[model samples]
Target: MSDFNLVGVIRVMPTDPDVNLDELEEKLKKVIPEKYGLAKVEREPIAFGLVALKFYVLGRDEEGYSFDEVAEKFEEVENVESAEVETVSRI
Candidate 1:
């Protein structure tokens, strides 16, 4: 098996309108460690007034971590409304 697996991408959103999208994106990227296997980060609008931040994570189960861990970490970021898995596929 590959040492790292492209597990999936997680979606994050801002809790309020006064958030700076660019700054929040940077913070989200920082929360994902290299060990967790970060691939890319993107921004998309989920609703008319809501935007979502996508985090691509790649790593194996033996890496000793889970999506829940990452989700919680994302929630801890300032201005982050919520974080969740959008989709998962084997690499």
Candidate 2:
């Protein structure tokens, strides 16, 4: 990838139905890592009334970079139940 830039989607599953995305997104804006370029949180239906939150993420393709840990960082949010890498590619 050009300049070690990597792109991917981080899947965020809320801890409960009561958690709303907009507010959680606000909290995420400040805590995500310096290497992270998080953008566009898209909520999609998984099953029932539950939703899966997917946010496009950009990071450096460097030796120390790790996708799983990045997602784990996302999980630090109180509203997040679990976070993981759903898709990844170089651009």
Candidate 3:
């Protein structure tokens, strides 16, 4: 086991525009464990001024922190909401 890599792209939005997406990126690190990886994937196009920030969390399906589990942890952060969130594991 522990012989493969899985990357989950978490689509999260802010409760209010006041919540900086950039700021949340840093705070997100707190939720992910030390071994796992976290990084911002991309920003959505302007649509009614509401945008979704995507993040990539890396671990292992072979044997590591589950993607969805850590993805949900992002919600624990203030002003962050998870909707249309999904876990993608591709070999």
Candidate 4:
């Protein structure tokens, strides 16, 4: 498979300042099934002390799901203002 074949940018906005990135990432990771793909969650700051999680999904070649499905799963997360696929690239 090519690099990041099921690549996409998932932006997650927090509902409050009390949000813990590390803790939240742990919970977020659980929302997806292990068979779907592997996730790499990172912080993306929009302002001082204000940031969001950028979730990158690298799916397995045999995984038959789509970005829309992944995004919906993320949106279901509590304390998450919103989750969307800003961009996607596949081969």
Local error of candidate 4 at residue 90 (angstroms):
2.8
Clashes of each: 0, 0, 0, 0
- TM per candidate comes to 0.83, 0.82, 0.75, 0.77
Cand. 1 Cα-lDDT: 0.80
Q: How big is the positional error of residue 61 in model 3, measured in Å on the Cα after superposition? A: 1.2
Of the pair 1 and 3, which is ahead by TM-score? Answer: 1
Q: Which candidate comes out best when scored by lDDT?
A: 1
Tens-digit lDDT track of model 1 for 1-91: 5477557789888997668999998887778865787888887876567777888887676647677678889899999989988777777
Distance from true location, Cα of 54 in model 3, Å: 0.7
Which whole-number lDDT from 0 to 100 does residue 70 have in model 3?
66
lDDT of each model, Cα atoms only? 0.80, 0.77, 0.69, 0.74
Evaluated at residue 77, the lDDT of candidate 2 is: 88
- Rank by lDDT, descending? 1, 2, 4, 3
Q: Which scores higher on lDDT, 3 or 4?
A: 4
**Residue 51 displacement in candidate 4 (angstroms):** 1.2
Q: Write the per-residue lDDT of candidate 2 for residues 4-91, one digit (tens) a residue.
A: 4787788888888777778877776666677777756788866666677887877777876777877888899897889889888886
* TM-score-best of 1 and 4: 1
Worst ten-residue run, lDDT, model 3? Answer: 82-91
